[PDB]
Swiss-Prot record, chains A, B:
Binds 2 Zn(2+) ions per subunit. Required for NAALADase activity. Zn(2+) 2 binds at residues 333, 371, 499. This is Glutamate carboxypeptidase 2. Stable at pH greater than 6.5. One of its GO terms (cellular component) is membrane. Gene3D superfamilies: 3.50.30.30, Transferrin receptor-like, dimerisation domain, Zn peptidases. The gene is FOLH1. PSMA is used as a diagnostic and prognostic indicator of prostate cancer, and as a possible marker for various neurological disorders such as schizophrenia, Alzheimer disease and Huntington disease. Homodimer. Changing residue 333 to N: No effect on enzyme activity. It is found in: Cell membrane.
């Protein structure tokens, strides 16, 4: 038989290992020749594997690179202007790669050029609450200062935005061993920790879903008319550079001014973590000077798009996508995911060669320039938005398959919760001690739901990866799954060698997944989801699961507002409409589920599959969220303080945030009521798409 | 058999006559009790006629009414401040109706209150080119003046916008006999001309598709959060009032200053048509003073929505809609159309009672508050936008069925051209001298296509009626058809008694259509279109007709740009991408048509019916046109100078308009190139929806 078990059994750990090795021998930085060569290889192999069509889709987008003959670095200067300490110009390369060419040195992509010199202020993780603490409580003014912030907790672009709004003239990001050095494990190459010379690369854009900064709304094709740089979307206005903890220690050890306000501001280095501004008495006249000379350049990128045409509903698309570009070798990010995608295509192709086709069309994508702001996936979605919004069933992302070896981690729309629970109950756990138990059992034991008991945690989607345009802009049901660590406070910080030259094939093969069994489990989860989505007669979405979460999110946002009872009385702020809509959604979803279970009629089926497919679409508001026109989903958006985190009822959440500090409370509460109306209306409208059609 | 001929034969002129009489005995002004009573009657009758469900959908929207105890009027005052002439407080009521209550006096809906006093300037039709002539050529400054403008040629809201931007402090609109008195015909009640005391009511909003001024984007339901008046959409900033030509003659006869610049500025009254400013020597110290005391008030409105559920595709909707609210008795506008809709519902219901159902669902709508800015249709479309954009096949409008008795007039999307040509070839002409000939033959003879020879004229859709939200915002294929006059220069001015108290049942029965044969022909065209759209196995749209017009529109916009060859060289302005897209659209549409003709498979059928249904949808840009977010169609929009007229490639047209007057030509031409890119991309994207799906 050609069924899901056939598909799953064809997947092999050994093939994933071979592909990972093949994908990680040289750097594949977006916009480079090496990455174009890999694109061509994948295109050729996907054709050999059996896909119906495999094309490259190219775009010309804004990228950012250091200047090869004018290196970025930071100094401490003395009052004579002698640079008495300089940060490193490169990460010491790992063993056996000290002769690889074209390793990009650590830099913050899209930083402007500048040579700002000033006094340092230390701002902890540079989160919104860290800046509130500095400015409001400690009365420290960051205006005209250079801020130094540790990586972790929130997306680095949010740190930079926060530092800009505080009036900083530059930002230095560093990896503290508190966040990137697990106790008791050795530094690379002898273990999986970050060495003192290691540095995390990464972009510092605040695009809010726009894609290429020069062409918001439209694909960056050959005739595109581009914004000038001064009008580009999301570029930072102050220079930014990342460093390792050996270098950070040199900059932090001389810091004076105020003590850290409490222990949550102290990392693990042997320094006081004084917030500053500036250095202690003896060194009071020394300054810090940045030298950033990176350039932004429009550069061609290439997505590989493979199609496996559906036998019955070829005009319904299930998309499996993940990126191919890496900062350096991409041992985990992204090639651990791309190797999984490659073995999934191979397996589907093996069934295709035996005469099988999926019910619906499956599209496979190898995206480019994810690391520079989701540019490849977003431009392709802009180009194909009409096809996607009328035909897109689901998108499953496939970046890093592993960031640890402890248990599964899943983020997806509520419409896929039942699917994930059901699939993981049929898969074998790879974990030690759970031999012969299901993955559902191990995952549920290790990652219990905070609400539900006997169920696993599944989190909300925000941004940070290539599903963003499909879910937040277009309203296509989306999901993602990987193996992760047991390190809860670090869930947005990255694994220690994240975006460093040390993330290599050897890292994975030696320290993460020697038997490629966690990779295989992730291939079964991702590929199993795609199989069911593309093959199930009735789409495997359960609208009742959305009804349950909408009530939870309504309770949560009401509870936030209720911290302000006097204002709710004064301005007549009622959540009654939103609860009414949620109640209606629950009732209508229950009735739809009954019809779906109780309806030979392919029109009724597809009419009801269209109702299922367009349900996520119904949560899109074509006017977008306030000042974020490309985040259009009313139930979820990437958090305004941390793009990696999803926020629920984001329009109301943002209207309430720090509301006690707004100068015109009537106006501020008016905008809360407006967002409650938009949210109640959208919930009711989505519910009504599940009513009988006529 | 239950086929189109059965449907058409059931329609009766006598029933349309009976319904028109029934609908026009009392005023039905939006927001009044009388109009709610008519809504309830229609709802009851549609149920008796056989519809599956008939509901009222209500909204609370901003309307505008004169103050019953503080009348609006205009004076000439002398230097002592004595009002020496006053305009009328009401139109003399027609015979037999001099005792009807609640006839609203002439007023401009949504005018602000004010009592501005000043010198008059006469601005012809107050078109963009009339103000260019005054200001640029004649060097007459309208700042702080009261402008007096004749109705005609363009929507009155555009006149007011133009007068505001010229700095006018008030506007007086009047009906000149040149435009509203056909030579050789008598004034009402003895003929169909406007008497000197007759006055055209009408709103002066510039909503650009927003619907209710207080709730743009969302339905004005019970929990809606409303903008404050100061932030409302589209309200005029200066007082405005309409008058008849007896009154206009008193205001114009004393005008001095400059002679009219040419004969196209002179109407038919016995006055010089001096442009002013102000009065000739003897009366130089007299002024004109307006007194406007109308109030804007949030008021409940009611749409009637009837459903006839489809037998095979109940989740595909064909909509027949027209409004019910009238300024006074609505003898032509709208009840000549509503009586036609009523007989169409009756006929469909007669087939339904015999066991027939259409293939697709048909929705019937009696809209409210059309006269106050399309408010009923727009709020309902905002409420139901998700259902409409995923299920809406087509919208056929049904306002006034007759505005003359000469020949057919049609405006529709190119997707319906073949349908209209084919249907009119099967209908009998009602015209004298064409007994036994087709309506296609008479219409083609009387209204020849300017391009095509042997074909009739069909015009582009703009705004001015309830199809606007469905077509311009949502991208649902739309059409409209009525009987019209032979008076080409008057095609946007209205028939003489338009929006006056004189448009009565007797007007129609005596002077327009005594045998109700033109009404019946229009019922056959509108109802025949709905029948074919709701019943044809393959949707009756021909994508090749869009390809033909896109080439014509591309040629036209290129020709406008080519009036500026030096700038096109300097700024490298190329239309090559747009022509390429049109060429691709033509090729792909040809191939799709071949597959459609050459494809027992209901999946392929519906897959191809979905391709047909979503083709109009593909021309929507979710970012809208510049500063007009609710006009989203890239090929068509209501003209920025005349909302009644459609404009093609409106984004490029507006970027080119008066470009030689812009102070920063680099920026102005940059924006032309941007609009060419958006247009070429959208054409190509629409074409790609017709490619094989996988
Ligand atoms: C959840 O679904 C329910 C349907 O099961 C839906 O209920 C609807 O609620 C609205 C708003 O409450 C009702 O609106 C009323 O409609 C009647 C006519 O049917 C009007 O007369 C009412 O207006 C009067 O009362 C108002 C409130 O006091 C006054 O402000 C107003 O000036 C009038 O005096 C009112 O508009 C509607 O009838 C029901 N529909 C039903 C029961 O079928 C509810 O709205 C849904 N929730 C959401 C968030 O959409
Ligand atoms: C109408 O449909 C046709 C397809 O039948 C479609 O043609 C496409 O045109 C684009 C743009 O001209 C082609 O883009 C080229 O793609 C190749 C790789 O295939 C690139 O190497 C080319 O880039 C080079 O040349 C450029 C121009 O001189 C340089 O600016 C650039 O720096 C490179 O040196 C170029 O991107 C594309 O291949 C075809 N596709 C085909 C033939 O299948 C056309 O775009 C459609 N029209 C519209 C308006 O969409
Ligand atoms: O690196 C990226 N993404 C990593 C981020 C790893 C650190 C934070 N982790 C999460 O956000 C996360 C991981 C897994 C799951 I299931 C859910 C969330 C990833 O998604 O694997 N994306 C790049 C590009 C910019 C768009 O974010 C970056 O963040 O620098
Ligand atoms: O009166 C309205 N519509 C009339 C307008 C009649 C004069 C101008 N005629 C056209 O625009 C027209 C008529 C028929 C056809 I087929 C196409 C265009 C109608 O559509 O019949 N609408 C109202 C409401 C505001 C939204 O325009 C008005 O214009 O005051
Ligand atoms: C990754 O695997 C690919 C595919 O096997 C290798 O590319 C092939 O290399 C052989 C030998 O040079 C050529 O004959 C083929 O034409 C290549 N096939 C392609 C590109 O589809 C590639 O050598 C491997 N890369 C590494 C680093 O091992
Ligand atoms: C840090 O690097 C800077 C820049 O290379 C060094 O300063 C330079 O030293 C050279 C050789 O002595 C001079 O010719 C340049 O003019 C200096 N440039 C600048 C910008 O100062 C500096 O010596 C280095 N500091 C340390 C401690 O290694
Ligand atoms: C997950 O599996 C459960 C258990 O099999 C599925 O729920 C059953 O579905 C069938 C078919 O509709 C019903 O007859 C049973 O009553 C259901 N059992 C329940 C609700 O306990 C569920 O459909 C699956 N979820 C998917 C496929 O998304
Ligand atoms: C328009 O026609 C309607 C429907 O025939 C008339 O309303 C009916 O009037 C009779 C007699 O008063 C009542 O018994 C019915 O209940 C009404 N039916 C409805 C409202 O559905 C109405 O009288 C006519 N109007 C005019 C001006 O002639
Ligand atoms: C035009 O109407 C105005 C307003 O009614 C008339 O002026 C009023 O005349 C009455 C009675 O003589 C006075 O008591 C009011 O104070 C006047 N009001 C104003 C605002 O002036 C005026 O007489 C009328 N003119 C003509 C020619 O009929
Ligand atoms: C309008 O009528 C024409 C003439 O009947 C239709 O065109 C024919 O359609 C049939 C069925 O596809 C073809 O086999 C013929 O070759 C067509 N004749 C032509 C193109 O000259 C046309 O489809 C009708 N338009 C509609 C229904 O929208
Ligand atoms: C990089 O720097 C070198 C000199 O250090 C300079 O000549 C060149 O302009 C720069 N390259 C850029 C800005 O792309
Ligand atoms: C911070 O310092 C800048 C620079 O002098 C000044 O303009 C700003 O007002 C200061 N703000 C606060 C809150 O002290
Ligand atoms: C793999 O799991 C083991 C056993 O718990 C653990 O000691 C090791 O550190 C894990 N590797 C990684 C990278 O987490
Ligand atoms: C209408 O005018 C009368 C007096 O002329 C006044 O008392 C009332 O306030 C007005 N009505 C309004 C503004 O609705
Ligand atoms: C028109 O008159 C006003 C009022 O004095 C003045 O401000 C404006 O500049 C004038 N414009 C022209 C073009 O004469
Ligand atoms: C009806 O048609 C006749 C004959 O051409 C014409 O004289 C008459 O004026 C028409 N009525 C209207 C309202 O146009
Ligand atoms: Ca873009
Ligand atoms: Ca509204
Ligand atoms: Cl992922
Ligand atoms: Cl109409
Ligand atoms: Zn990645
Ligand atoms: Zn990454
Ligand atoms: Zn009308
Ligand atoms: Zn009207």
């Amino acid at each position: 038989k050609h069924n899901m078990k056939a598909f799953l059994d064809e997947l092999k750990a050994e093939n994933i290992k071979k592909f990972l090795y093949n994908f990680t021998q040289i750097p594949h930085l977006a916009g480079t020749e090496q990455n174009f060569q890999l694109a061509k290889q994948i295109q050729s192999q996907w054709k050999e594997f059996g896909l119906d069509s495999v094309e490259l889709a190219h775009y010309d987008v804004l990228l950012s690179y250091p200047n090869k003959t004018h290196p970025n670095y930071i100094s401490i200067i003395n009052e004579d202007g002698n640079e008495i300490f300089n940060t490193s110009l490169f990460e010491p390369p790992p063993p056996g790669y000290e002769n690889v060419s074209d390793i990009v040195p650590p830099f913050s992509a899209f930083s402007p050029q500048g040579m700002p010199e000033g006094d340092l202020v230390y701002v902890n993780y540079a989160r919104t609450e860290d800046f509130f603490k500095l400015e409001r409580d400690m009365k420290i003014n960051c205006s005209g200062k250079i801020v130094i912030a540790r990586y972790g907790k929130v997306f680095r672009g949010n740190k930079v935005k926060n530092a800009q709004l505080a009036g900083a003239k530059g930002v230095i990001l560093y990896s503290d061993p508190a966040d990137y050095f697990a106790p008791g494990v050795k530094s690379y190459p002898d273990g999986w920790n970050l060495p003192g010379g290691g540095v995390q690369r990464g972009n510092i854009l605040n695009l809010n879903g726009a894609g290429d900064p020069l062409t918001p709304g439209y694909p960056a094709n050959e005739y595109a008319y581009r914004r000038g740089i001064a009008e580009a979307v999301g570029l930072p206005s102050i220079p930014v550079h990342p460093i390792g903890y050996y270098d950070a220690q040199k900059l932090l050890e001389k810091m004076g001014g105020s003590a850290p306000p409490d222990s949550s501001w102290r990392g693990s280095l042997k320094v006081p973590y004084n917030v500053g501004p500036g250095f202690t008495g003896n060194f009071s006249t020394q300054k810090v000077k940045m030298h950033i000379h990176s350039t932004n350049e429009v550069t061609r990128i290439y997505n590989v798009i493979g199609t496996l045409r559906g036998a019955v509903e070829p005009d319904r698309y299930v998309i499996l996508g993940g990126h191919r570009d890496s900062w350096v070798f991409g041992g985990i990010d992204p090639q651990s995911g791309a190797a999984v995608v490659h073995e999934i295509v191979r397996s589907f192709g093996t069934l295709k060669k035996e005469g099988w086709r999926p019910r619906r069309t499956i599209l496979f994508a190898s995206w480019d320039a994810e690391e520079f702001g989701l540019l490849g996936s977003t431009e392709w979605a802009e180009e194909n938005s009409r096809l996607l919004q009328e035909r897109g069933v689901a998108y499953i992302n496939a970046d890093s398959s592993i960031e640890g070896n402890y248990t599964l981690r899943v983020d997806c729309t509520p419409l896929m919760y039942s699917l994930v629970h059901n699939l993981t109950k049929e898969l074998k756990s790879p974990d030690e001690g759970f031999e012969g138990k299901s993955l559902y059992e191990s995952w549920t034991k290790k990652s219990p739901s905070p609400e539900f008991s006997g169920m696993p945690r599944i989190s909300k989607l925000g941004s940070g990866n290539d599903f963003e345009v499909f879910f937040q802009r277009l309203g296509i049901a989306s999901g993602r799954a990987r193996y992760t660590k047991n390190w809860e406070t670090n869930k947005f910080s990255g694994y220690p060698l994240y975006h460093s030259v040390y993330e290599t094939y050897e890292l994975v093969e030696k320290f993460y997944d020697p038997m490629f069994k966690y990779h295989l489990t992730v291939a079964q989860v991702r590929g199993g989801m795609v199989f069911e989505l593309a093959n199930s007669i009735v789409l495997p979405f359960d609208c009742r699961d959305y009804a349950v979460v909408l009530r939870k999110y309504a309770d949560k946002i009401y509870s936030i507002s209720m911290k302000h009872p006097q204002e709710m009385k004064t301005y007549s702020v009622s959540f009654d409409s939103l609860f009414s809509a949620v109640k209606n959604f629950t009732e209508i979803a229950s009735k739809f589920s009954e019809r779906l279970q109780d309806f030979s009629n392919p029109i009724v089926l597809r009419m009801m599959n269209d109702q299922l497919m367009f349900l996520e679409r119904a949560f899109i508001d074509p006017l977008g969220l306030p000042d974020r026109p490309f985040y259009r989903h009313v139930i979820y958006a990437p958090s305004s303080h941390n793009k990696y985190a999803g926020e629920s009822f984001p329009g109301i959440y943002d209207a309430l945030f720090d509301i006690e500090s707004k100068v015109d409370p009537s106006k501020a509460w008016g905008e809360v009521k407006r967002q409650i109306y938009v949210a109640a209306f959208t919930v009711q409208a989505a519910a009504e798409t599940l009513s009988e059609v006529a």
